Amino acid sequence: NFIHKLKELKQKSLDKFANLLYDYGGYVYDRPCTFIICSLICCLLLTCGFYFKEHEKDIYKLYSISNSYAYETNETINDFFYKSRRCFILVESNVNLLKPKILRELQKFEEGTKDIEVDLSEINECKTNSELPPEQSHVAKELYKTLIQRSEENLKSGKINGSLFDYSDLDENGKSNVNFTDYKDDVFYPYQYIPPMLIKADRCKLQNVFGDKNLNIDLREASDGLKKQITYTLEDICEKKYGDCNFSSLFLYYEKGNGYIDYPIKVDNLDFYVNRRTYKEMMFKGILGNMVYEKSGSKYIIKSANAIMTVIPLLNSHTYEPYALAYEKKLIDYVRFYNLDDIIQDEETNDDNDPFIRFHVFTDRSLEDEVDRISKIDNLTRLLLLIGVLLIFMYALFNNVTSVLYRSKPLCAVMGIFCGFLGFLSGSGFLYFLGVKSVPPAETVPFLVIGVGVDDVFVILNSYSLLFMVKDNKKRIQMCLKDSALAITVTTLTNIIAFLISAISPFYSICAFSLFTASSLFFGYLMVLTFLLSFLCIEAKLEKKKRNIFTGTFHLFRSISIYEWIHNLYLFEESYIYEEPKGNIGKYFRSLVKNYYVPFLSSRFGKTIVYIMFTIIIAMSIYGCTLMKKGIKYDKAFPVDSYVRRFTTAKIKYFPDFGDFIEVYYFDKHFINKYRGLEKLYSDLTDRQIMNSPKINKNVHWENTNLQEELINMHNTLESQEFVTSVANGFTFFLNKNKSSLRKENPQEFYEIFANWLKKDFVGNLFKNDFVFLNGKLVAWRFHYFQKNVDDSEISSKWLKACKQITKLENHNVQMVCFHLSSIFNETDESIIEVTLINLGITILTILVVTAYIIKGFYSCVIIALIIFLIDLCIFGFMCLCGITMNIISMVILVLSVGFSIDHTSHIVQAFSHSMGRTRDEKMKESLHLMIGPVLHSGLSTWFVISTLFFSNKDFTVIFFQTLSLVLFFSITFSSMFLPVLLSSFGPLH
Ligand SMILES: CC(C)CCC[C@@H](C)[C@H]1CC[C@H]2[C@@H]3CC=C4C[C@@H](O)CC[C@]4(C)[C@H]3CC[C@]12C
Ligand SMILES: CCN(CC)S(=O)(=O)c1ccc(-c2csc(Nc3ccc(C)c(C)c3)n2)cc1
Ligand SMILES: *[C@@H]1O[C@H](CO)[C@@H](O)[C@H](O)[C@H]1NC(C)=O
Ligand SMILES: *[C@@H]1O[C@H](CO)[C@@H](O)[C@H](O)[C@H]1NC(C)=O
Known part of the structure; x- marks a missing residue:
């Protein structure tokens, strides 16, 4: 019943479509x-x-998952911590840069960086045509006013007294639409800390950003010339260190007469040196590159260095978002166009090449700018x-x-x-x-x-x-x-x-x-x-x-089944319509196929050769599947000549230790939930369910001696890792400095001692910006550590997961989130495998259903499915064998490989099935003679169009070309060589 009726309906539909x-x-x-x-x-x-036409330029939109947990972590960090934009300016040279002449020139370069001026007319975020001030919630504004008043009062008083705070554990709801009464009695330490999420001021008013300049200008209600008259410099949007800009450059050594440029530099510690005159810290390892010193006379005398790095911190807040975004742009134009080759020409080199000096720059704006430049087709x-x-x-x-x-x-x-x-x-x-x-x-x-x-x-x-x-x-x-x-x-x-x-x-x-x-x-x-x-x-x-x-142009200016035919031709061959005319479209190619290729395939020698060759290919595919690697580095998406990639390469070259700046954060769930209220198919939701445990990061007693000892052991373990070079953990310093004082384990005593250490101690003064106390309880904090840069993304992800495991403290319900820029890409590389394994199955099932609806017979459908599976296996095995990793591009092409190869496989199989040959060999001959031209052409055409991508400057496009070439090659080989032999051997006959 079902077999007869469904097949009859299918045949009738196909015939009606053909007649239409x-x-x-x-x-x-x-x-x-x-x-x-x-x-x-x-x-x-x-x-x-x-x-x-529009371009999507958001990196999170393009590459991250829809519900990425890295996005949530970044949102939390920006909402509750004061990060600072960091502009890196690196200078490379085959000539040592420590000569006094080059040092003076680089000092002039740094002063020029300080001297850049930006007029307000260049602030594209204030163009008198936007709704840039969205409405902040009323309770949030009242709380911000109260908190800023309390911050002023506490800073003026300068007293730490935790006697009035409640140290009892919070309820599940956070108790000891949101009511201002609960928030109105919050005390934050350090006293100048206020959650950045609450700082939503009118960004277009100059009084909100530049109080010192004393100008009351509304940029949304100001003329272009009036805004162009007013200018600001680096000092107005730069993080302050003792009043001065918090520059991280070599020239802090010579600051205020501590040293002299002409004389050689001598330093008592090559890791952490404090300028005696200016009381400013400086790390020579991060600044100088291929540093060579002497270590004589109880001090280190630095002779040569073939690289110099400078870090400029810019304030990173909402109100300071556009202005910095302006200055950074100009800074880039100041660096990428700077030349100092005149002095370099004379000096002796290292690589014996022509002397050189190259300046490189990297900012938070750089990645977005490069994505924007790449979006337009070059x-x-x-x-x-x-x-x-x-x-x-x-x-x-x-x-x-x-x-x-x-x-x-x-x-x-x-x-x-x-x-x-x-x-x-x-x-x-x-x-x-x-x-x-x-x-x-x-x-x-x-x-x-x-x-x-x-x-x-x-x-x-x-x-x-x-x-x-x-x-x-x-x-x-x-x-x-x-x-x-x-x-x-x-x-x-x-x-x-x-x-x-x-x-x-x-x-x-x-x-x-x-x-x-x-x-x-x-x-x-x-x-x-x-x-x-x-x-x-x-x-x-x-x-x-x-x-x-x-x-025809000259004159215009003047003015029976084909399978039956091929079967009849082959029957007549056993001895007008059978012979093609001279110059036909595919006469010569079909002649070559019939005279040479078909007898080769039908011969026993050809069959055994094909079987051995494809057995070898499948074995190689299996071995490649054994050598499976996952992940691609994000920078491969950019051309090699882009200044971002050049800067990264250099940094890796001259600064192997300072590869990645991993930041580890702890947030109290109750505090985060309390302060968040003011704002008002694929199951791979990784790194989210673990962090959402009901009994984690809640009312953690940091005064516990056992927890402090666990923190110290965790810091030591993190230092013990080979991939970790340096760790900057203020909590470890505090615990090491004070052990007897913390024996009491009194929460008020712990709070007061920590506050005093942050307020008075030099190291505490350095680490003041990494701790948040609310109502006498440490509700959020952080530390940082450097990780060796490596060219393999998989091992980097392994290192990050190991760090996350190390930071876990299950005994005290504490787990700290580890974050970095590469975390988003690592998450994507971890999710791509599951996404592809689902999409490939869905595609295969649908394609098999569709082709079974049109392919005559059922055994032919089984043969098609087997060929498709073998083609996919070979494609994956050889992509793993050729060094291509399981990344977004390769996985997408692997998904599309089914749709690409099914065309050739279905062509050959349907040609075989519709033929009227008696033996299997005759049917194979007819199928080839009919549909081997189109099968070869449809693959050679695609590969010829694609092959030009082999020279594309973007590595993602190169991976696309390589994977697509593998797909096309295996589809063509398995549809024109393996499939005809398989059909000759075990093909259906009726
Ligand atoms: C002299 C001894 C006893 C104490 C010195 C310890 C050194 C190694 C520590 C203490 C203060 C630390 C710094 C404190 C703050 C920051 C800012 C952050 O964005 C990067 C790390 C950095 C720059 C830290 C690097 C390591 C550091 C310099
Ligand atoms: C660093 C921020 N980026 C994360 C990598 S990104 O902005 O999202 C980004 C991502 C990719 C490219 C790119 C250039 S060429 C290129 N060929 C390409 C061809 C075919 C297929 C299917 C794919 C996926 C790629 N793809 C450029 C930027
Ligand atoms: C803290 O405040 C309480 C309440 O007034 C007071 O009794 C106590 O002396 C204060 N502590 C200090 C160190 O001032
Ligand atoms: C505001 O008022 C009540 C009483 O103080 C408070 O407990 C609650 O948080 C708020 N009421 C609501 C949200 O209905």
């Missing part, structure tokens, strides 16, 4: 020019949507696209031009390339009309689309090449379209399905890439059906009139 396409081709043949002009007009109207990508288009045009012309000119189809190939390009343009325009923003990966959308947009073309030509016997050109075109309609529709539908399923991934970059590719493929399919088919009709009319393109 037959009649559609018949209708198109009468109106080719009308279809051409209408399709072109529609494509241009859709392309007009490029005027609404000239190199356009040149590569042009070269790929030229290659595919040459290949198509070479295949479709033969000895006889009027039987050739060059115009069809050219218009097929044009159909691919127009489909890409129309799809991109439609999605821009829908509002989807263009991610940088979309730069690779054109190539791929063209690489697919030609495939259907070849298939149609194949059918039109096989129907030379039909004298009626209109009926010939109708039958050609009838034969090729199911194949073309299934191919495009499968590609669209694969890309749409890929678009489900949480990362917006992949979602946009897949959406653009799917829309472009759909519109390219429509263009193939109309624009290309009309040109096919025109060239068929010219062929019937026996005039080629040139003669």
